[PDB]
Amino acid sequence: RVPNYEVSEKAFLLTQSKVSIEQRKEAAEFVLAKIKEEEMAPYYKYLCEEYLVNNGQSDLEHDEKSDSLNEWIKFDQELYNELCKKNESKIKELNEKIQKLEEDDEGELEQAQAWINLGEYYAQIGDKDNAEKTLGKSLSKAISTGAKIDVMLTIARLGFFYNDQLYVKEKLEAVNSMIEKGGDWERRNRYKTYYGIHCLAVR
Amino acid sequence: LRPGRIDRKIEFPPPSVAARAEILRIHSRKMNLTRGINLRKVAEKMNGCSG
Amino acid sequence: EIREAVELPLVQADLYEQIGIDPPRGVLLYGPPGTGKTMLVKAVANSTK
Ligand SMILES: Nc1ncnc2c1ncn2[C@@H]1O[C@H](COP(=O)(O)OP(=O)(O)OP(=O)(O)O)[C@@H](O)[C@H]1O
Ligand SMILES: [Mg+2]
Numbered sequence: 001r002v003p004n005y006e007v008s009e010k011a012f013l014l015t016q017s018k019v020s021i022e023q024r025k026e027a028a029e030f031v032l033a034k035i036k037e038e039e040m041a042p043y044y045k046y047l048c049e050e051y052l053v054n055n056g057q058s059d060l061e062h063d064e065k066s067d068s069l070n071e072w073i074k075f076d077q078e079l080y081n082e083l084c085k086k087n088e089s090k091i092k093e094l095n096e097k098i099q100k101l102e103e104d105d106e107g108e109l110e111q112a113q114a115w116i117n118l119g120e121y122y123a124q125i126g127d128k129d130n131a132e133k134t135l136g137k138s139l140s141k142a143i144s145t146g147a148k149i150d151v152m153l154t155i156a157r158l159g160f161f162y163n164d165q166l167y168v169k170e171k172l173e174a175v176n177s178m179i180e181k182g183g184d185w186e187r188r189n190r191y192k193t194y195y196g197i198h199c200l201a202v203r
Numbered sequence: 204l205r206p207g208r209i210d211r212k213i214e215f216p217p218p219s220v221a222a223r224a225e226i227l228r229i230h231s232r233k234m235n236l237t238r239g240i241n242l243r244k245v246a247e248k249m250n251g252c253s254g
Numbered sequence: 255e256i257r258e259a260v261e262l263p264l265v266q267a268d269l270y271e272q273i274g275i276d277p278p279r280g281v282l283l284y285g286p287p288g289t290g291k292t293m294l295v296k297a298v299a300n301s302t303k
Contacts, residue, residue, distance in 0.1 A: 233276065234275065235273060
């Protein structure tokens with residue numbers, strides 16, 4: 001939940017070369033700490049692209065420019081190794097739980113809660129496509145109206161991560177349908193802000 | 204209350220603490236709460252004596 | 255109890271609606287008429303306008 005935007009906010013500031021020298025080097029520290037600890041490994045490869053002509057770059061597997069104005073940028077091979085390991089591990093654990101929920105009937109509430117956890121991991125690693133798929137199975141099992149609304153917001157959030165305004169816009173049409181089915185004022189405030197931020201993103 | 208005139212007699216007690224929570228939960232669907240409020244907690248703050 | 259009952263649906267009815275309390279209805283005032291029941295109605299009416 002918490003690194004997903006906070007890493008993106010600092011990573012945007014870091015990209016620019018039209019910021020202050022000081023502000024870019026403060027940001028850069030928060031970004032880098034969080035890749036290693038939280039396993040933001042695939043979005044980190046992605047972010048090496050996003051400079052390109054802007055400076056800072058000092059990566060060991062991805063392009064560098066002649067002018068490195070930053071050094072709180074590094075690619076390490078340990079990052080790649082970790083990925084491979086952690087990936088299989090999380091996948092293996094939950095899977096088996098899902099099969100267990102199939103054997104003895106419990107699969108309405110708990111298998112969707114397992115697949116929510118799978119999209120949060122997928123989302124963590126920076127995959128919008130495969131987070132969304134898992135968050136798709138969560139729907140099919142019959143759950144509360146509250147849970148269904150919460151899930152669509154999460155998917156739309158992954159749109160903000162890659163800064164794709166259209167990806168936000170499309171998902172937030174579907175929430176407009178369900179919002180009055182649940183009828184909550186709680187998840188309507190969330191809706192007001194979710195939309196808030198989306199409307200702020202366009203002109 | 205003479206013979207054969209009344210043949211089923213239904214006593215109704217004051218509410219249980221499980222039953223008093225189930226009346227509270229019906230009323231909470233009209234209202235908009237905040238999550239983390241247990242209405243089993245509320246039913247135990249109360250003791251009631253009627254519905 | 256009167257500022258809840260009379261004054262709150264005039265200033266805005268929708269305050270009730272959005273919390274999800276449905277509004278109280280009618281007010282009965284009872285008592286000896288020497289108690290200033292009648293007096294209270296005139297007091298809040300001049301005030302709410
Ligand atoms: N709280 C008070 N402060 C000042 N004067 C008061 C107070 N309560 C009542 N009085 C006075 O006592 C009188 C009677 O009050 P009011 O005019 O409200 O009628 P009431 O009791 O409903 O009578 P009925 O309904 O039988 O006509 C009024 O002159 C009122 O100003
Ligand atoms: Mg009077």
